[PDB]
């Protein structure tokens, strides 16, 4: 475990954002993107997934939270991997609670596979979270979720899901079908879908402005 890239709070941290990068990345690029929208009282934590073989691309070894097999809803998914990665995320949250920031003052998010992991984590933890930012991603192991609202700790969590309309790796329709399913799993009044014209498998400045607004609305100052 190389230590996560962190954007510290100015001097007094009362909330945290845990953000998981996408395939092949480290946590550093996203931590700098978050510094550009940082709020004084918010700690930003971007852990790094470990290098591992990735079945999708000739087994090439690169950072990935879990193995990626295919690009299709009919593709087999790395169930043991996703769940183990999910357990590791909850341990990272629990450690922040011990550090001093309650779980309901923490937003979990990610990009692509990291956003997939963040959604799955948020929907399976009894750790009540402040919200989720899911960027260009999808809901993994979707068939494992029974009908109806999950109930559970995060039945009311607020979710911001973002997706470029020219993404060639996670087609926009995957994000769209994901948000609509999320709206049957948690309270639909707290789920926001935003799309970005021209954007591919990347980020853009308007999207980062919507994430900042989302984070600041749900994690407002307490001083
Ligand atoms: C309700 C949900 C319906 C659609 C679910 C289908 C999921 C298919 C996703 C394929 C993976 C895309 C790979 C992205 C890589 Br570049 C990464 O980050 O690992």
Task: Please bin the fraction of helical residues.
Answer: 25-40%
CATH superfamily: Alpha/Beta hydrolase fold, catalytic domain
Bound molecules: 2-Bromopalmitic acid
CATH topology: Rossmann fold
PDB class: hydrolase
Keywords: acyl-protein thioesterase 2-bromopalmitate Depalmitoylation, hydrolase
Assembly: monomeric
Entry title: Crystal structure of APT1 bound to 2-Bromopalmitate
Gist of the model:
With 223 residues, the protein is α/β, with parallel strands linked by helices. Helix content is 31%, strand content 20%. The chain has helices at 28-35, 79-99, 113-124, 172-185, 205-218, and strands at 5-7, 15-20, 42-46, 51-54, 60-63, 106-111, 131-135, 159-164, 191-196.
Question: What would you say this structure looks like, in words?
Answer:
The protein is α/β, with parallel strands linked by helices. The protein has a single domain (1-223), classed as Alpha/Beta hydrolase fold, catalytic domain (Rossmann fold, 3-Layer(aba) Sandwich). Helix content is 31%, strand content 20%. A 7-stranded mixed β-sheet has the order 1-3-2-6-7-8-9, with helices on both faces. Helix 2 (79-99) packs across helix 3 (113-124). Bound molecules: 2-Bromopalmitic acid (J1W). The site of 2-Bromopalmitic acid (J1W) has 16 residues, from helix 4. Keywords: Acetylation, Cell membrane, Cytoplasm, Endoplasmic reticulum, Fatty acid metabolism, Hydrolase, Lipid metabolism, Membrane, Nucleus. It is an enzyme of class 3 (hydrolase). Homodimer.
């Amino acid at each position: 475990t190389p230590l996560p890239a962190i954007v510290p709070a100015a001097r007094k941290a009362t909330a945290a954002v845990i953000f998981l990068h996408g395939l092949g990345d480290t946590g550093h690029g996203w931590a700098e993107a978050f510094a550009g929208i940082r709020s004084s009282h918010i700690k930003y934590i971007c852990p790094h997934a470990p290098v591992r073989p990735v079945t999708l691309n000739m087994n090439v070894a690169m950072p990935s939270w879990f193995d990626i097999i295919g690009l299709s809803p009919d593709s087999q998914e790395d169930e043991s991997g996703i769940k183990q990665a999910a357990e590791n995320i909850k341990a990272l949250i629990d450690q922040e609670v011990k550090n001093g920031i309650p779980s309901n003052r923490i937003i979990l998010g990610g990009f692509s596979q990291g956003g997939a992991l963040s959604l799955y984590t948020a929907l399976t933890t009894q750790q009540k979270l402040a919200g989720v930012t899911a960027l260009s991603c999808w809901l993994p192991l979707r068939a494992s979720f029974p009908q109806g609202p999950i109930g559970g700790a995060n039945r009311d969590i607020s979710i911001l899901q973002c997706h470029g309309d020219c993404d060639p790796l996670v087609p926009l329709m995957f994000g769209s079908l994901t948000v609509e399913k999320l709206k049957t799993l948690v309270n639909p009044a707290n789920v926001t879908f935003k799309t970005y014209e021209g954007m591919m498998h990347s980020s853009c400045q308007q999207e980062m402005m919507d994430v900042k607004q989302f984070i600041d609305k749900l994690l407002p100052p307490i001083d």
